[PDB]
Symmetry: C3
Subunit: 336 residues, 3 copies
């Protein structure tokens, strides 16, 4: 009841962590602070609140991924509805856990403000993604203060999937979206310059083409891409044609800036939770990996969860799904 | 509690309706899809929640209006406080009823986002009208999706009465208001191009004069006017002088665009709920009808409710008030 | 439950007050309506809700200040969290009391919308200060309507302390802040032109220098300054050097406009609640008073409360603190 006695916030204790290199942006690539080229390779897990509700929010989940799936990265998709439901303090308290767990295993975190829609009009694909410019600024202000000088937390993914859904959510406008991303970047950099902001384009984070002529005018950033199988629609389905379409929409970005494909994956058209644009016969697997390997692109597969689709696992014993078994072997081999 | 299992929204079932012509805009008039000129003539009823609270939300209300009062149109003034209080899902569920009832009787609906104030500053005449740009966009996004390809729902009245109340609510600015209406129109047209947006000017939807030089730059729209008796203030009270003042503020619009007078009416200065600007000795009745008949203007009288003023009815047995008896005979004769 | 029966607001009854001169702006000074030069000299008390919670919201508090401390002014720092917690109606009801108490004692009120942060981005130093542009407009709309033509309420301090905290809250931008203050001023002046708006600059209301080239383009305003001891940081701590630095940041304003230092004070570096920028050995006391007396600057010391720091009193028996005893004698002598 005494609002005047509500404490000012605290910062994560950097001394609680074991030594871990910082990742940074240099030209079109990520490097570690030993100067060696770095690639984020890993997975999304579900929202922290979803996992807590079935007691699945545990270090054992991070251990499974690091020890058996070859990941060096986990993406945490923080859904705004969950942020509000747990409340900032409780949610950050659990992010703290993820930081200690990831640090101990030598892996990195992407913190993703996981909304879908058009932030300038504050209209969204679904209420679970509902937010405001104000709440979005405040999330990043709180996150940047708390995790200042923390190497484990490597990437701040500002807004998961910008889309206007055919302009039903607003009129998509690059200038307006660019300015808003630059405004978030300035808030972040005023508080911690060692973090990497990750910026997304339109069409559910698929279309980076506006940066050919109007890139975000800030250094040290990377760009997101969500190249699901059915985004590119060539008439003849083969490597060359998919490669050319990927090149035009997002791939070109990797020539100049680092790119993280923070969501990608597939399930069979008659498989679990099959929906556009993630339906595929499986050939997309080797194709997207070949393309990303050629261009040096980083990635986090969606999703290491047995309820959310497309799944990487069929149960909480970690039985791999089709795409799970595929990506698991890709990541284990890349780690070698 | 499982926010991730909240369903995506559904659309009204168009097959549940009996055949009914669409109304559309052609030049300065409305036509039906048989190509015949159409005029909206009817009434406002009270907010859906108000009616539900005294069990007055019933098909029998629509039957009374269609069978005995000569209406082809009902305006539903959806008050934002009621939208929030029932919640969108429950409110839309009741709008669905109104659609089936209206369809069955061959009459049409105007859906009116019933706020009073200045949306660009989000300041209002009374808390019952309180809203935000965000909530307003979301209302229209939900409405347009749900009632796609539904002929019964003919008009989307974006914001009932713009006013700054002497600039106490903000600085009235046509450019800013025009742009915001165009932004709502684009959201709407991206989702359903068969609906007619209705746009209002300042001075509680009375002053359309800014459209002489700066009309909304979108096709297929109509303009609202709320020509209450005391809005025009001629020194000599007669047909000619009122006609000239109405001509300058709003009437001229009917030469180029269709106009719906979505609120109008009077009560005696010593009558029930008598207040500026609705006080009149009764001579306004024949005068506004003559003027509207001359210019082809559509209208919905305020209000077919015995509690809200000025009333068209004294009780829920539909005993006509002065203005009720007047307009009832006008509408019955026009129907012939 | 009947939202349609929620009453429209009422205005403070001016006939309940005893006769009291209005204060107004003329050039760089305040005058009373007898034409005599006026200086606001007094104190802040704590937020109304804080005082109510320990039954300290009482006329006896105002009597103590007027009869024994030589004040002609009390600043009420209305914290947005408290405004929401009591609710507008209950909060205004208590402001009404303050008005009657102050009027009876012949003293004046500064109503201060007591937030700290950057309103254009709606990001703040602490949640107790959290607000929005919408809530801020609405507060001033309600305040101006209610206290129309009330002499006792002399100053409307629009936003206590603008700051971006190193641009962690947003990019500080004078043009944007100037425009927003002008927008609030226009809402206020449309409703009551007899009140004095008080505008603040950046760096927690310390830096008025942008008004050298871009002053708020409205008449009848005054400017705020919060010249805490440690704001100016001369290497050699003496009158001349502090005076020059105060001159450059805020003092110059008093040559052209009236200035109220609505927050100032000190405590010993090892005293109660000692924090930057209020730590001082006591020499700031005579120095800031000399400077303000030279320039004709008005002031309200922070804070006449035994819990909030730096205190003017050690207990609710009004035992003076160091700064309390100092300012008490300054104000008693100035009153003579
Ligand atoms: O996290 C909660 C929830 O997530 C579910 O997965 C989401 C995905 O996170 C999201 O990327 C996906 O977005 C789809 C969208 O649904 C499609 O409608 C849209 O389709 C586009 C297509 O991309 C275009 O190429 C095509 O031409 O047009 C259509 C639009 O008509 O594509 C985007 C991605 O690009 O939505 C998913 C769910 O709807 C999980 O499945 C669920 O289990 C989780 O609980
Ligand atoms: O729906 C809830 C509630 O509605 C009540 O009716 C509302 C009307 O819906 C609304 O149009 C009306 O607005 C008035 C406003 O009150 C007047 O102050 C204003 O007066 C203007 C005038 O129009 C100008 O011409 C004149 O020069 O200046 C004055 C301003 O000083 O006029 C507008 C309409 O133009 O407000 C009504 C109630 O206040 C029902 O009466 C009630 O029963 C319902 O519950
Ligand atoms: O009302 C509730 C609460 O108030 C507390 O007092 C507040 C003051 O009202 C407020 O003015 C003060 O703001 C400080 C801020 O805390 C400092 O961080 C900041 O320091 C600046 C400095 O001013 C610059 O000159 C310097 O160069 O940089 C630093 C920034 O790093 O200075 C501002 C004022 O200028 O905050 C106080 C509390 O934090 C009461 O103390 C408390 O009891 C009440 O409950
Ligand atoms: Cl898009
Ligand atoms: Cl107006
Ligand atoms: Cl600042
Ligand atoms: Mg970091
Ligand atoms: Mg329709
Ligand atoms: Mg006053």
């Amino acid at each position: 009841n005494d609002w005047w006695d509500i404490p000012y916030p605290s910062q994560f204790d950097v001394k609680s962590l074991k030594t871990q290199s910082f990742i940074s942006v240099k030209g079109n690539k990520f490097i570690d602070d030993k100067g060696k080229t770095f690639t984020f390779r890993g997975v999304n897990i579900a929202d922290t609140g979803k996992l807590l509700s079935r007691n699945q929010w545990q270090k054992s989940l991070f251990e499974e991924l690091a020890n058996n799936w070859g990941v060096n990265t986990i993406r945490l998709p923080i859904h705004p509805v969950s942020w509000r439901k747990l409340g900032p303090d409780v949610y950050l308290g659990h992010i703290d856990e993820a930081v200690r767990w990831a640090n101990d295993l030598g892996i990195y975190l992407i913190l993703d403000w996981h909304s879908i829609g058009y932030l300038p009009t504050e209209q969204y694909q679904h209420p679970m993604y509902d937010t405001t410019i104000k709440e979005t600024r405040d999330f990043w202000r709180r996150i940047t203060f708390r995790y200042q000088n923390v190497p484990t937390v490597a990437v701040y993914e500002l807004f998961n999937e910008p889309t206007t859904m055919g302009n039903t959510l607003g009129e998509r406008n690059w200038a307006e979206w660019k300015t808003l991303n630059e405004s978030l970047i300035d808030m972040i950099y005023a508080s911690d310059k060692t973090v990497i902001p990750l910026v997304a384009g339109f069409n559910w984070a698929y279309d980076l083409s506006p940066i050919k002529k109007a890139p975000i005018e800030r250094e040290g950033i990377a760009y997101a891409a969500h190249p699901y199988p059915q985004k590119a629609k060539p008439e003849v389905k083969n490597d060359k044609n998919f490669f050319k379409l990927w090149d035009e929409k997002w791939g070109f970005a990797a020539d100049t800036y680092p790119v993280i494909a923070t969501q990608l994956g597939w399930v069979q058209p008659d498989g679990y939770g099959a929906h556009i644009p993630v339906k595929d016969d499986g050939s997309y697997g080797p194709r997207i990996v070949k393309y990303m390997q050629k261009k040096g692109v980083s990635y986090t597969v969606w999703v290491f969860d047995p309820d959310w689709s497309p799944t990487m696992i069929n149960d909480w014993d970690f039985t791999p799904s089709e795409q799970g078994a595929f990506f698991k072997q890709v990541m284990l081999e890349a780690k070698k």
